Amino acid sequence: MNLFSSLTLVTLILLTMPIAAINFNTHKFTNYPLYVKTTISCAFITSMIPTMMFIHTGQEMIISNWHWLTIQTLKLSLSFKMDFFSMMFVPVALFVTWSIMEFSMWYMHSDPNINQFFKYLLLFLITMLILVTANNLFQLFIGWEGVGIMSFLLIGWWYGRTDANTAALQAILYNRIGDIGFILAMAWFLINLNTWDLQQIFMLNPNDSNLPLMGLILAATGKSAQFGLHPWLPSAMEGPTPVSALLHSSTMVVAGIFLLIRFYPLTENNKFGQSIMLCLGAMTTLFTAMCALTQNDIKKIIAFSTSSQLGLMMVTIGINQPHLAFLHICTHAFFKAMLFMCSGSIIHSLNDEQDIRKMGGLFKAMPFTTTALIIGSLALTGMPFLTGFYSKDLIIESANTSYTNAWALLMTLVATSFTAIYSTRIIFFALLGQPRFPTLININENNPFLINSIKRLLIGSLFAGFIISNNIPPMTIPQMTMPHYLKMTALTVTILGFILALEISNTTHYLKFNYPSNTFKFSNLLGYYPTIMHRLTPYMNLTMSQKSASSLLDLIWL
Amino acid sequence: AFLPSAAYLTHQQKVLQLYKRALRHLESRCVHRDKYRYFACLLRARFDEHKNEKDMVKATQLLREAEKEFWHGQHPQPYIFPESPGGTSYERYECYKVPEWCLDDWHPSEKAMYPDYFAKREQWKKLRRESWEREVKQLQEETPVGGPRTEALPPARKQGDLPPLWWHIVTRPRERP
Amino acid sequence: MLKYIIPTMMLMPLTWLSKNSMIWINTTLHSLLISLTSLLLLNQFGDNSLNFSLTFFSDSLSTPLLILTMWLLPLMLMASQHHLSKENLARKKLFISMLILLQLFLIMTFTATELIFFYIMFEATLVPTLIIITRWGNQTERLNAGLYFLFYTLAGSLPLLVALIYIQNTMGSLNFLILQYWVQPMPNSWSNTFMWLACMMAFMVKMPLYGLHLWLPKAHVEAPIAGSMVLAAILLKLGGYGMMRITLLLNPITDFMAYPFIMLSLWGMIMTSSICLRQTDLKSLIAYSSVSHMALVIVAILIQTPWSYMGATALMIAHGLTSSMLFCLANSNYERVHSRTMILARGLQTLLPLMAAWWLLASLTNLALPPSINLIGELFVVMSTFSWSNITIILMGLNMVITALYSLYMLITTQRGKHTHHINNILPSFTRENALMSLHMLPLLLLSLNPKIILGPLY
Amino acid sequence: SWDKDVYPEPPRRTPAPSPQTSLPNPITYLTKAFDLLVDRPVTLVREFIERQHAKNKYYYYHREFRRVPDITECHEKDVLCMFEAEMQWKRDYKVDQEIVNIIQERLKACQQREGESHRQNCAKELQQFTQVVKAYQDRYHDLGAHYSARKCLAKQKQRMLAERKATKEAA
Amino acid sequence: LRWQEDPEPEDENLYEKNPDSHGYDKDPAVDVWNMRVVFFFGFSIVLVLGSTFVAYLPDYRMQEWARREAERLVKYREAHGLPLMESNCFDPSKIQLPED
Amino acid sequence: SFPKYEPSRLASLPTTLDPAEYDISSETRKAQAERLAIRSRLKREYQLQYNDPSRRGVVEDPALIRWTCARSANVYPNFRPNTKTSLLGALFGIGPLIFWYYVFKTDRDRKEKLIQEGKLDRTFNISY
Amino acid sequence: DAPPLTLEGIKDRVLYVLKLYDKIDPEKLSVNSHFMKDLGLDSLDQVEIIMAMEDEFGFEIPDIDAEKLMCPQEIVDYIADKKDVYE
């Protein structure tokens, strides 16, 4: 026992020690990014021991170590919940962050605020492991708002640029609309259950839990970019590449999904919450994957990829399979962080070129980047026995064989095909064909930082699904009996997506010029949703914030 | 429309700008290079069909429905260059573009860290302040009554003088600090 | 309380007998010593308030407002000493004397055992504040605010005076300790309805209430920095303190007289926060933010649950510190660019990185980032108003979107983007200014460690 | 430590180490390394500190409040006695709050300690929690922010009138 | 023309005549000692010793006592078979209800 | 033929598809030349103060000062209470207050009626 | 990464583009060859040359400057202005 809780707290204190180092500085640093990367490597090594001794016995515990407040019946203590979710998320998050920082020591080398960048990225990591280890709603709200604010500060990293500040304020807006529902859930549990602690919520086990679960679904909508509150995740590609790699693909954006996986004993006894999660997840995984088909910025395409995977996570929560959703989080982190890292390696090699229509011929120019991008795309689509096979296919193997919304299943399959479509679209326009980038080739990737940082997540994207899924215990019963047209569903739909998009890509070499269709104009302008509501809802606010609020009432009449 | 020197766009400028925007939006439509180059010569032929049109009212109408053609056939997200406005790297380093006068607010312990730089900056500022009144009295006798008509400035006429309104154009920050 | 009133009065011979170059240093030193002395008021008990004499007492409501009041004087002396450098020495000592006299009035306003001594000190605090605002306000254009001060005197403090004299004749006393045990229920009658309005409307204007907030984005604008600091930090909170004392006598009629004014605040924080999205004046934006935060304190006092009083006094302390720091940041740019226009000086993180760090921290406390006591007060008020009505969470949460929206906008406009070209007098940050920001922020951050001392008498 | 009756812990049942595979686990080696490198120096420093605790043994005490007369037997508007009654009532209010907090700590620790069988094996703690929350709600809910012993007595009297009327209407 | 008026005084810079100015005063010795007073009696005195004072407050509003007292009373009434809390705060025998 | 672009409040018509941009008349030459003249004169008046070394401060912009004085000061003294101002100050002034008043009063009367009839699940509700 | 541009490099690259253009002969092309008057090109050809410069160097020349660049030396001078060469 004395090993588990000790190294659990040592991981978090070790992550906080470079924040004290960067705040207690007088000299100019002897490579402070290397210091933070070494610290997070050792924090990974430290958190490996509680994970291994959890896989040995199933040892979960709670560390309610510091009494903080007592509001008359509510003892808010500093309480860390070490369960299956923390024991599988903390090594994956530390491993991904360690690869992102060895990536950033190459990519962000020209930035004179590199110490501020690594400081902010460590602050994000601290707030995120506050989020995923919290035992009450208040400490989880601390980590929740912390990853929201570090999202603000890392989107608006180039703070002189107007679009970065605009996207950062946009992300804060949609996350606070999710925070309306999170505070609704906290309010409901405090009034009806007298607690913010998870244990008393789970032990009391309320039955009229539609309203707190609607609050939690609105919170996951604001946080995991579900439909209605989605466009900030494509807008948030205006930040740097390791920001979009770590935060907005693999670590922050799974926290609404993690919030709903965390409250699984309430969702497993509320069919209405499961149905709403299933419908919203299927809507998001349709819409964002459809928008990804007709984009040309590679960071936008991989952001729509990760939001479609978040919608699929919401789907597999909505079929009452939360542990498969969390296995898909731990799986998805590796190859999606690696896809953003390889895309940004292309971007930095091609002198800040992000548009895929000026790329190509990079199969033999950037060989390691091409190899890892193909491996990440095939792990995304569901190639057999890569890491993305060990969760996502099982998701389909439980989405077919369950009492399910049928249209949600059909849109889930259309999303599964669209994943293959935009993956081979990225490989077509960025790796295949003949070059389209300008004439002064500065293409290079031979830094051990970049190569080792993509290499360790490559080892993850090859072996981690097998290793984790053979190291996690059963928490449901895997539905393993189905007809052969139903077992071969996800693979056949994925290969049909590959065939359809290869025919689409080979219609582009033809010497014909067609007028744009309405489907192309719809999917290219993002379902017309960021074009209308980003103009209309500010307008109807701000005129109402000036004409009647300031001028008419609160300067003349009142 | 809105320009610093001219108050309008000439018809020749309108034709060239519409040709350029048509080719750029076409290259956005027509990703591959040989395919775009084929359609680019086809579109060059379409623009050179009515290059020799003498009637400016008929050329005005042809330009107007050419704008309608370009608007009907435009790409929704055309290729913007990264440091072009609307690009992904546009105005990215503007947070690093510190104005030069902030060097005047440094402490002398860090001004002494770069002695040759500030020792030369003193005579740069000396040059500016003995150029200023000469270029003001240059501009006050050349500007017509009612103020200047166009925003363009005259150059340095005498030998030894400097061109007027020059300090912020010369001492502007680098585009990659 | 007489170990605090007498040093505050000895700051008058300290400020008038000091040498001409020493009058800021001496008053700052001895007011910091009084603020260190002010922690002896933390001898509170779970059953009994700390009752010093027949004239003065201190429960856990008055104690943090006293500590904040005695802490606010050195910060005002730091903030107001730059723009009084070319002032006459005697006028400078008159300024310091009016600040000391305002602290003297406040620290025996919050400890007033009896309610008409509370009224005398409560309406005594307006006069040095009035003289500070109108003698050192750098411009005075108050054509509409005179009629509003007449409306404050008519609808506010005078019915409170007549009502307190009526309670003095009826109950026989206005000791709050006696009124804890001799309180009669105030039933439904028209006499008791005008009684409720007389007991409440003075403190409604002092909070301020929405619709009655017309004075506050004028009096904050036309004031010096010390006046705006003491208005945002303490002088709004006299209304909340007086409501939490006077709602003892107003039961149970409050349970149906609160319903209009609660609406006036629950919609009102939706409006004024939205008003902050269209402010050209930064100081007016911070003023409307103060209205948008004191609306929650009005609701939390009127719904009179324990969680609402805990959240309301935590929000009062937290918003005092936060909005005082916001006005000090607004002045730290106004002393350079000489205009309050928020779109004038932009991109200031390129020029002042540590000051932009202070802007970031004050914005994050302004938008209630947990675990700060802004969020603790905000959150407990939201929980209690959910217990009041489950729909109000919408009007809470929507406010908690817009409260974020103008908080970062104030950060994005002033500190981010491209710097303004034609402004070249942007000096580096003086150590005085950074010390002022830290003496605001570091107590506000340390109170997140131990918030139980700012949660009122029924923690 | 503490009192094992107010904080009950059922007798722990750990299974024996049963090594089936020939590969040596890392956890025994890391446990021995933690026992040598970490447990021993911390334990030696704690023994030094405890010797220094023994070199000056001095004590503190739990304050006792003898029961003064309550609000029922205090005269109306007699502040000298009903002040004592109010102080007694407020001390009992805060102590009842901490009793509720103790029962909540029991319920949460039972749920975690039983793990997945928490619904089957924590019926008694949930029953005690339901009884103590019903008692605390009948005793102190809906008083308001200006609560007192008079408000609590009037709520008790209204509840007793309701219980007497419910007893009367049943016969 | 308009009256005899002194012109607008320009805003002085405290860094020109004193590049080590902290902004407290224009006299440098007065400025540095104002800085030392603000930093010592603000940070070294009020914040540090104040947090040390607040951290070791002797059971602020008797919370800890009230837990330990509860740890007595539960132990008194778990053992004697009593319920943990009565539904009546006062004794229902010493209460006279209005009859009807 | 082609779909004509529809302008909107939040979707303005382009400069290219507006017909009055293609005016060639001499009065449009006069208007464009006077706009270029005013813009050039204001540009010169700006950057003589901007490029001045003897000035170290803020080039004050009286259009900006005039904008802030219009957004703050000119609101009351150019008010006239008429039908339009009174009806619009009664719609958005006492409208949503009455709306949320009746909504919250209705829900609280419903909740009070359910509590005094023993209906509302107030089981574990001891924080309030 | 991001190699420094020189007037020799900008000159040689602009002339390297114009020597791969089938309306400009590589023997009459100089550094001061005017497009309309000396090389005999159209304004359409001049717009294609400035767009080829945009394709070459990876940024955009605006139209108010693209309508006036009438020699390769003006192109080299404009890229020298927009890239800050010979530090």
Ligand SMILES: CCCCCCCCCCCCCCCCCC(=O)OC[C@H](COP(=O)([O-])OC[C@H](O)COP(=O)([O-])OC[C@H](COC(=O)CCCCCCCCCCCCCCCCC)OC(=O)CCCCCCCCCCCCCCCCC)OC(=O)CCCCCCCCCCCCCCCCC
């Ligand atoms: C009683 C003893 C207690 C001891 C422990 C201390 C407890 C807290 C004390 C105060 C903590 C903050 C102090 C620093 C901030 C203010 C100054 C500043 O900006 O310095 C920048 C500077 C470093 O920057 P730089 O590059 O040198 O120059 C500035 C740059 O130009 C430009 O700057 P920049 O943009 O590059 O970087 C600014 C960056 C910007 O970063 C951010 O804005 C990110 C912050 C938000 C997201 C992350 C946090 C989310 C919440 C989770 C963490 C809290 C809970 C954790 C607990 C477990 C989970 C529940 O800010 C930071 O890095 C600050 C780190 C700490 C942030 C705390 C949260 C602030 C957010 C708003 C309130 C949130 C809720 C309340 C939190 C209360 C915590 C107790 O720091 C220093 O030089 C340090 C000065 C000395 C600090 C002393 C601190 C103690 C003071 C108290 C004295 C009395 C007690 C004695 C203790 C003495 C200990 C030594």
Ligand SMILES: CCCCCCCCCCCCCCCCCC(=O)OC[C@H](COP(=O)([O-])OCC[N+](C)(C)C)OC(=O)CCCCCCCCCCCCCCCCC
């Ligand atoms: C390098 C730094 C380390 C220090 C090196 C030098 C010292 C060597 C190491 C030994 C240290 C001394 C012995 C151990 C410490 C003392 C232990 C002890 O009993 O301390 C008393 C107590 C323990 O609590 P407690 O339960 O005894 O009492 C609480 C107080 N009452 C009852 C009044 C409410 O305090 C601490 O331990 C303080 C440290 C806490 C650590 C975490 C701080 C986080 C702060 C976050 C602020 C916001 C919170 C928001 C979230 C809240 C929850 C949702």
Ligand SMILES: CCCCCCCCCCCCCCCCCC(=O)OC[C@H](COP(=O)([O-])OCC[N+](C)(C)C)OC(=O)CCCCCCCCCCCCCCCCC
């Ligand atoms: C108060 C009303 C007026 C308001 C304005 C006041 C202005 C004047 C200021 C006067 C002085 C200050 C007064 C308030 C002081 C409040 C602080 C205080 O006393 O705290 C007591 C608290 C008391 O904690 P406690 O409640 O556990 O105390 C237990 C009681 N004793 C000590 C007796 C056993 O002190 C601490 O918590 C200190 C613990 C050790 C130091 C902290 C360790 C962890 C810190 C964080 C580490 C990094 C985390 C990750 C960060 C990531 C990046 C963000």
